[PDB]
Amino acid sequence: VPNDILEEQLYNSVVVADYDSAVEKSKHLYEEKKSEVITNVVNKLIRNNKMNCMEYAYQLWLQGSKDIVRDCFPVEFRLIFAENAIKLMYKRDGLALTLSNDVQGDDGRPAYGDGKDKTSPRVSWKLIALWENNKVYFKILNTERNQYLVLGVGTNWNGDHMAFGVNSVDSFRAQWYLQPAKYDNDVLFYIYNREYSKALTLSRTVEPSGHRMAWGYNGRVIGSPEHYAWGIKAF
């Protein structure tokens, strides 16, 4: 077996979502001094906007291969799965996501891109994996407020949903899946809601203080991560 065939095999395995055999292959290769194959494969999954890349990483993390995820994937993956604190930064506008600090309701805090704040604890978040139907999904937890990001049931005229924090996860509205992408020299992700299949985005309508409210966008984003995707920073 040449690197081409072995690589194609590993990639094929990831794309068809046969994760036990993809992990078998990886564990083999990392032992046989063939890390460049796994690394090329990651790069190709990530260039091709393949979602399976998340499940593949998580399966390595769960099956005694954290080290492969640490060495052969970009640091973001480790940041996700180690449930380290992160900042979700909207690529298009360069704002960090947060929850409002002043709320007249007892229920949920509205989410938005913070105009002044890239630093304070208010932009700290954590992603929490769960496994269902051969797929990986995430709860998104604001660390200061101990509240989960959700989309609501209501919609505006175009059919976007509001995003805000809620105390717990009892539905698919509070779950999310990631689709990796590349722009410039960095890794980005679109973030879709599990219930409604909409991407989390910031409105083009600016608030006086530079703010932009967060919405579940009803529209097409694939192809333009420099407009609709998020960077994950180590905080």
UniProtKB/Swiss-Prot annotation:
Detected in larval hemolymph (at protein level). It comes from the Eukaryota. The keyword Signal applies. InterPro entries: Lipoprotein_11, Lipoprotein_11_N. It is found in: Secreted. Keywords: Lipoprotein, Secreted, Signal. Gene3D superfamilies: 2.80.10.50, Lepidopteran low molecular weight (30 kD) lipoprotein, N-terminal domain. Pfam families: Lipoprotein_11. Transmembrane segments: none annotated. One of its GO terms (cellular component) is extracellular region. Belongs to the 30 kDa lipoprotein family. This lipoprotein belongs to the group of structurally related '30 kDa proteins' that comprise major protein components of the fifth (and last) instar larvae and of pupae. This is Low molecular mass lipoprotein 3. It comes from Bombyx mori (Silk moth).
